Amino acid sequence: MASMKKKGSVVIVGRINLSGDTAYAQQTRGEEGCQETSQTGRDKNQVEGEVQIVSTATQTFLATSINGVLWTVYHGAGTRTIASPKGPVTQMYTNVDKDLVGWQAPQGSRSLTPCTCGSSDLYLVTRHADVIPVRRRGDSRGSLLSPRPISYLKGSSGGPLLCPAGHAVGIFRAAVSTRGVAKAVAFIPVESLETTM
Numbered sequence: 001m002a003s004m005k006k007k008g009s010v011v012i013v014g015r016i017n018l019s020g021d022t023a024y025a026q027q028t029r030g031e032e033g034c035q036e037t038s039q040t041g042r043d044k045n046q047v048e049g050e051v052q053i054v055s056t057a058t059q060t061f062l063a064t065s066i067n068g069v070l071w072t073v074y075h076g077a078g079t080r081t082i083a084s085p086k087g088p089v090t091q092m093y094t095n096v097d098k099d100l101v102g103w104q105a106p107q108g109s110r111s112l113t114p115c116t117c118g119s120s121d122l123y124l125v126t127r128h129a130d131v132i133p134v135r136r137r138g139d140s141r142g143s144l145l146s147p148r149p150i151s152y153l154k155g156s157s158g159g160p161l162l163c164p165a166g167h168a169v170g171i172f173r174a175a176v177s178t179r180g181v182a183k184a185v186a187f188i189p190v191e192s193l194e195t196t197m
């Protein structure tokens with residue numbers, strides 16, 4: 001009992017910058033500082049933007065702020081706290097059945113607005129700041145206009161699918177893979193986030 005370890009916090013280590021005309025990834029914390037912040041849960045770094053790059057000791061993925069909540073996938077975050085300036089913050093939403101978790105959005109982040117356009121021309125944002133056109137094909141699936149090896153999408157779970165006007169349509173969850181090629185993606189629809197709320 002006395003030696004049982006604690007899992008560390010999820011740590012914001014960068015962001016996907018969408019503020020201007022060029023999308024690009026920014027790193028805001030290196031691997032050593034990430035490891036230390038994960039164990040303490042105390043992250044005093046400035047947060048900006050809608051799409052964060054996040055890490056645990058063993059994985060790296062994305063998280064997206066919608067309606068004042070920073071959302072990501074359960075398969076990346078599990079039940080972990082997130083590091084914050086005052087110490088670890090507990091998830092306010094956890095739904096393993098949806099592969100969904102959420103924490104209160106960090107001070108300084110910006111939130112996306114849920115889409116009400118009813119449009120099926122979407123855009124997936126990856127951890128490399130690629131903006132991938134995706135045609136919506138059902139409630140929780142979309143096809144890539146240009147299929148990509150799954151290598152290209154790995155590490156982008158938790159990222160957004162957006163409509164043409166930049167509203168949030170969903171959270172990227174899984175790639176639909178044939179012979180290692182992603183022809184489609186599965187996502188958590190923003191309406192499911194809204195119901196979880």
Ligand SMILES: COc1ccc2nc(C)c(O[C@@H]3C[C@H]4C(=O)N[C@]5(C(=O)NS(=O)(=O)C6(C)CC6)C[C@H]5/C=C\CCCCC[C@H](NC(=O)OC(C)(C)C)C(=O)N4C3)nc2c1
Binds near residue numbers: 059096150151175186
């Ligand atoms: C533990 O509790 C849970 C609860 C719910 C759950 N729901 C799940 C749906 C679930 O799927 C598993 C995780 C998820 C996954 O790899 N996502 C990311 C990603 O980038 N991840 S990540 O950032 O690298 C990482 C790994 C966090 C750091 C987006 C894709 C990028 C590339 C695809 C690589 C090859 C895997 C292809 C799987 N295709 C797949 O299953 O397709 C369907 C059509 C669904 C069969 C798939 O995509 N997969 C399996 N695992 C869970 C686990």
Ligand SMILES: [Zn+2]
Binds near residue numbers: 114115117118164167
């Ligand atoms: Zn919209």
